[PDB]
Amino acid sequence: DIIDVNGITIDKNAFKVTVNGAEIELTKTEYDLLYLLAENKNHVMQREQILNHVWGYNSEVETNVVDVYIRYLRNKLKPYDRDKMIETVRGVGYVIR
Amino acid sequence: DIIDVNGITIDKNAFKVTVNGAEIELTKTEYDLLYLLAENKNHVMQREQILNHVWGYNSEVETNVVDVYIRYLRNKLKPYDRDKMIETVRGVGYVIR
């Protein structure tokens, strides 16, 4: 939920984005991935690069979490017709254009 | 900073609260502490209880981080004249009233 106390509004989930006057609730990893892509508008990001930035340069995770979470992120954006902004550059990686 | 892409607005720092049309930038731990207190409006929270909720039930941290971060939180609220909402109940703990 959302809390309003001393004139301060704070959400239990910090990892929200606003769109069309509505709210998308994300996880930390989804939020950081969206930011990373958006921060790099029009520049394609190689999967390993996304891994370094979102999961850590020394992460033991399998590189395909990026794929898994790109799908998670798209699914969160589908209800608001924003999913097609995350584009697969097949063979190299992902871009927000 | 803040980013606006496909009609979506996302901040690099998720741990923001709004007040008087302005923005307070917090850390994760400060944000969770503010939420915990605000979620428990008018109920005093014992230090150990805050420790369990914000730092974990099995945390090895010294119990006085709560004090340290209450001060951090107050200092973040002082510029907007909201610091006095976090009250010391001396000897037991903290409350938002």
UniProtKB/TrEMBL annotation, chains A, B:
The OmpR/PhoB-type domain is annotated at 1-97
Q: Which residues bind DNA?
A: 1-97
Q: Where in the cell is it found?
A: Cytoplasm
Q: By what name is this protein known?
A: Response regulator ArlR
Protein source organism = Staphylococcus aureus
Q: What is the lineage of its organism?
A: Bacteria, Bacillati, Bacillota, Bacilli, Bacillales
Q: Which residues of the full protein are shown?
A: 123 to 219 of 219
